[PDB]
Amino acid sequence: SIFSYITESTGTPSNATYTYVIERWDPETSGILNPCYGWPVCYVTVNHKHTVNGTGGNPAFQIARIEKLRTLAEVRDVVLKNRSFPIEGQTTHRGPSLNSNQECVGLFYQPNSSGISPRGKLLPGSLCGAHHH
Ligand SMILES: [Zn+2]
C-alpha cells in the first residue's frame, strides 16, 4: 500500500489548507499494473481529492512521467528515483465542499501535469487517512 494522511485541515470545506504526509510506499509484489500505461501522457503527482467523486485537483507537484511504465512496481521505482519519503507539505483545496472523510492527499496518476485533474485518481493501493489497526 501507499500510506498518506492529512494531519490538519484549516479553513472551510470548500476552501481548505491541508497539511499532509505521504509516509511510505511498500514494495509492490502483487503484479499490479500501472492504470495509465500506454496513455499518450501520464504523470504521477501529489494531489488531493477535489470532488465528491475522488478525482484530482491542482497537484501539489508532479513527480514523474509514467505512461511508459507497465507495472506499479516500476512506477514506485521511478518515484523513488525522483523523491525520498516521507513527502510533506501543504496544499490548498478551493472547490466542492468536502467533509473530513472526503479529504485526501496522496499519489495520483493523471494525464495532465497541472490544473484541475478530473481524469486523475489515486494510484491503486492508496490508503488515505487512518491506516488499519
Ligand atoms: Zn481541490
Numbering used by the authors: 25 to 157
Original authors' sentences:
MrpH resides at the tip of mannose-resistant Proteus-like (MR/P) fimbriae and is required for MR/P-dependent adherence to surfaces. MrpH is a two-domain adhesin (TDA) consisting of an N-terminal receptor binding domain (NTD) joined through a short linker to a C-terminal pilin domain that attaches the TDA to the fimbrial tip. Although MR/P belongs to a well-known class of adhesive fimbriae encoded by the chaperone-usher pathway, we found that MrpH has a dramatically different structure compared with other tip-located adhesins in this family. Unexpectedly, MrpH was found to bind a zinc cation, which we show is essential for MR/P-mediated biofilm formation and adherence to red blood cells.
In both MrpH153 and MrpH159, a metal bound by three histidine (His 72, His 74, His 117) side chains was found. While optimizing crystallization conditions for MrpH153, we carried out thermal shift assay (TSA) experiments to identify conditions that would stabilize the protein and promote crystallization. A melting temperature (Tm) shift from 66.7 ± 0.6°C in 10 mM HEPES buffer, pH 7.5, to 78.5 ± 0.1°C in 10 mM ammonium tartrate pH 7.0, 100 mM NaCl, was observed. Based on the TSA results, ammonium tartrate was added to the MrpH153 protein solution prior to crystallization. One of the tartrate carboxyl oxygens (O1) ligates the Zn2+, completing the tetrahedral co-ordination sphere around the metal, and in addition forms a hydrogen bond to the main chain nitrogen of Arg 118. The second oxygen (O11) from the same carboxyl group forms a hydrogen bond to the main chain nitrogen of Asn 82. Both hydroxyl groups of the tartrate molecule are also involved in hydrogen bond interactions with MrpH153 main chain atoms: O2 with Arg 118 N and the carbonyl oxygen of Thr 116, and O3 with the carbonyl oxygen of Arg 118.
